[PDB]
Symmetry: C3
Subunit: 149 residues, 3 copies
């Protein structure tokens, strides 16, 4: 699966210019942030992303198409008090919004995520190796980050 990732700030772009014939693509925490104790915080991952797979035959009742994909916790999240609220995120084929990780802080202390933490990863519904590239837009629409003005 191949992902096109639009970084929403330059600080993020520099993180991903760094960065793997692997199943998951790790995502960065892009900004130091405090998570209140006993809370769910919607943590903005500062990127938009489209995933491409070869067209496939599926039952329902241009070799390369958009596809839905998954936001998984990284196994090393287990070591912390944070847990993904929604278990596993399902990003649909369309999707053009900022990817959000919803993290439950299960402790009663506040928790500091730091820039460059990796808590979550994108994963293909097929488990296949992921490749990505930075692009400036996903498509022509404003939500795509493309088009005029």
């Amino acid at each position: 699966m191949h992902l096109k990732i639009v970084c929403l700030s330059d600080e993020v772009r520099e993180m991903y210019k760094n960065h793997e014939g692997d199943s998951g693509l790790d995502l960065f925490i892009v900004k130091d942030e405090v998570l209140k104790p006993k809370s769910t915080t919607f943590v903005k991952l500062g990127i938009k992303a489209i995933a491409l797979q070869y067209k496939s035959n599926y039952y329902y009742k241009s070799n390369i198409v958009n596809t839905s994909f998954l936001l998984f916790p990284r196994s090393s999240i287990s070591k912390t008090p944070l847990r993904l609220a929604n278990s596993i995120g399902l990003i649909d084929a369309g999707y053009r919004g900022e990817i959000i990780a919803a993290l439950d802080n299960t402790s009663d202390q506040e928790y500091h995520i730091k820039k460059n933490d990796k808590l979550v990863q994108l994963v293909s519904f097929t488990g296949e190796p992921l490749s990505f590239e930075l692009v400036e837009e996903l498509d022509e629409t404003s939500r795509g980050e493309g088009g005029f003005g």
Copy 2:
């Protein structure tokens, strides 16, 4: 992937006639229910379902088959204190029971769910788009809601 869904009551049938390219199919909470604080409740979704996909050759040591499939939380469950106790439910190809969501109320107060809330969704193992239709039975067994009599 195509879901044949059997609604277990008339009330549920109407909710599914009225239903709003997509990878998950939202399921309704079908009955106002109070969930106790700090507990796990097995919330009956009032439906049974099977999933149909193209037959595949798979390594294991008409072209439409029954397939196993996935029960995911909707991401809007995040706003609530309700968490899905088994993370992602696996429903096997053969399963003819009512679909249950096991919801942990992590809050220390009672949580009230309403008829028409949508907290969970069915999703295909391959993430392809889903269609569904409402049917009177899944198969000929009683558990499947079908066959002769009562």
Copy 3:
């Protein structure tokens, strides 16, 4: 999909020798006390690879190793244990022991017993699973 499982001990091998569906259950292999309000890395005492047919995938001889998944069993929900990382992703390249990160959410300790089945191995496609017990991967 098909799994090659190396049992890490004499005693574990037994449990799998005396064990086609969508997930393969894994045993709790030794009695253990889980502390209250805690996360424990519970060792399952197996190594495993998974084999599926090669596929064309977009990216920029019959068989290959694929990634597979570690799901909780639906029955885990009767316990106060939760899988910390929701669903475990075991990569194609992984040769180490399989661990289940379990959160004990109880304010009391919780004892797991050998022959408990709390988690299960599932394939990316939901296809029926099979395994054999080898000596090495």
